[PDB]
Amino acid sequence: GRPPVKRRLDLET
């Protein structure tokens, strides 16, 4: 939302 680019995307609903 949001955090910076480096991330582990949250796909889970």
Partner 1 sequence: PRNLTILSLPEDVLFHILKWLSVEDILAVRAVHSQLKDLVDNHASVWACASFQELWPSPGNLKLFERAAEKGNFEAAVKLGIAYLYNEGLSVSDEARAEVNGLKASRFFSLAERLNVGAAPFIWLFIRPPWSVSGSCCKAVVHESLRAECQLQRTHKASILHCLGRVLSLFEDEEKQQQAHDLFEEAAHQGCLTSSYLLWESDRRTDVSDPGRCLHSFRKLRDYAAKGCWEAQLSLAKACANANQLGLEVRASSEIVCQLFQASQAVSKQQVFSVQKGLNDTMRYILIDWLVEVATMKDFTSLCLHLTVECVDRYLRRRLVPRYRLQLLGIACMVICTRFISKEILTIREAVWLTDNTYKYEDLVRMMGEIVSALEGKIRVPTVVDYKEVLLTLVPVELRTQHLCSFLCELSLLHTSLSAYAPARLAAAALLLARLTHGQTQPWTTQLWDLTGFSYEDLIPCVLSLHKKCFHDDAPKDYRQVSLTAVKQRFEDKRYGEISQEEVLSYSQLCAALGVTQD
Alpha carbons 13 and 6: distance in angstroms, whole number: 21
Other CB atoms within a 10 A radius of the CB of residue 1 amount to 3
Q: State the binding string over 1-13 for partner 1 (x if CB under 8 A, else -).
A: xx--xxxxxxx-x
Number of residues in contact with partner 1 under rule CB under 8 A: 10
Q: How far is the CB of 12 from partner 1 (least distance, A)?
A: 8
Smallest separation, CB 13 to partner 1 (Å):
7
Give the span between the Cα atoms of 7 and 3, in whole angstroms.
7
**Which residues contact partner 1 by CB under 8 A?**
1-2, 5-11, 13
